[PDB]
Design a protein around this ligand. Structure first.
Ligand code: NA
Length: 312
């Protein structure tokens, strides 16, 4: 009947003689009450993926922005964005009301991440996380934290850890949430008592909560395009200048900046030249999902494009 298998102390598979996998097992048992044998059975099936390791290692004017932008803002994506928006309008409206994050931002994030559920990843989360936790010294501590949370998440939401698929870094569902984001920011937005990253309604509320938690200011401007050029100043979403320094550099805002007294200097390569922008706090909040000016600008403009296509 009951088979404790106390004498089955060595697991097979890609992580068979891996000291890190052994230490991780002891941690799950000691800290979370996992059964060593049940966990060895799970991890003996986990795969060490070279592709996951290669990809994690891999990470003018010539029109850079234009090329990045066209990967996301196309008739097909805008049209699919409209369908997703109309289909989940209640959830989007409810997220706006509860979290102060507008539909265009959420629709934009889900569009850029997975094309609204069409591309959510094909790699088993367990394989990706185990590979990065046990065979990647550089980010081993970060990924072991993610694997720990993933196994707890699977245990709680009652999932077989081996059945969940996602990105090469272990990101999941519509919004490509990492296990740590699920833990800290995911919410039951459908109201069924569970948090399913693959349920569009839960994903919508979870992205909204993530944004509010990262400082999204309701109704505030994201960024304002500037007239003029500022070649003497370093640019990027991490920069910060007073509106006075930017004016002194030859820039003027196309729209009033209200009470904002500082901003980041963003520069987009539009082929014929450079297009400068005053990055406001909400722009930086978007970069909290993916540390990239292009990413954040594409997320925002995709949402705007969809918002416009709905009007027609
Ligand atoms: Na739910």
């Amino acid at each position: 009947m009951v088979e404790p298998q106390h004498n089955v102390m060595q697991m097979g598979g890609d992580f068979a003689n891996n000291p890190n996998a052994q230490q991780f097992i002891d941690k799950m048992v000691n800290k979370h009450g996992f059964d060593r044998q049940q966990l060895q059975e799970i991890l003996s099936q986990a795969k060490r993926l070279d592709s996951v390791l290669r990809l994690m290692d891999n990470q003018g004017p010539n029109g850079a922005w234009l090329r990045y932008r066209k990967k996301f803002i196309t008739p097909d994506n805008v049209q699919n964005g409209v369908v997703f928006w109309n289909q989940y309008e209640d959830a989007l409206n409810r997220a706006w009301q509860v979290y102060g994050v507008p539909p265009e931002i959420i629709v934009g994030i889900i569009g850029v991440e997975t094309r609204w559920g069409r591309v959510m990843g094909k790699t088993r989360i367990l394989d990706a996380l185990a590979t990065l936790s046990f065979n990647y010294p550089r980010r081993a501590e970060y990924f072991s934290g993610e694997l720990e949370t993933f196994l707890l998440m699977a245990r709680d939401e009652q999932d077989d850890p081996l059945n969940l698929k996602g990105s090469f870094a272990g990101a999941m569902g519509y919004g490509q949430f990492m296990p740590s984001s699920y833990k800290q920011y995911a919410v039951d937005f459908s109201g069924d008592g569970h948090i399913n990253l693959w349920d569009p309604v839960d994903a919508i509320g979870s992205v909204a909560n993530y944004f509010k938690a990262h400082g999204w200011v309701k109704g505030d401007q994201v960024a304002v395009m500037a007239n003029g050029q500022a070649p003497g100043l370093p640019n990027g979403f991490k920069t910060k200048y007073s509106i006075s320094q930017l004016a002194a550099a030859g820039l003027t805002p196309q729209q009033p900046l209200g009470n904002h007294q500082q901003a980041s200097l963003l520069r987009l390569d539009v082929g014929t030249g450079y297009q400068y922008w005053y990055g406001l706090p909400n722009f930086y909040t978007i970069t909290r999902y993916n540390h990239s000016t292009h990413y954040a600008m594409a997320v925002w403009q995709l949402g705007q494009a969809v918002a416009l296509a709905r009007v027609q």
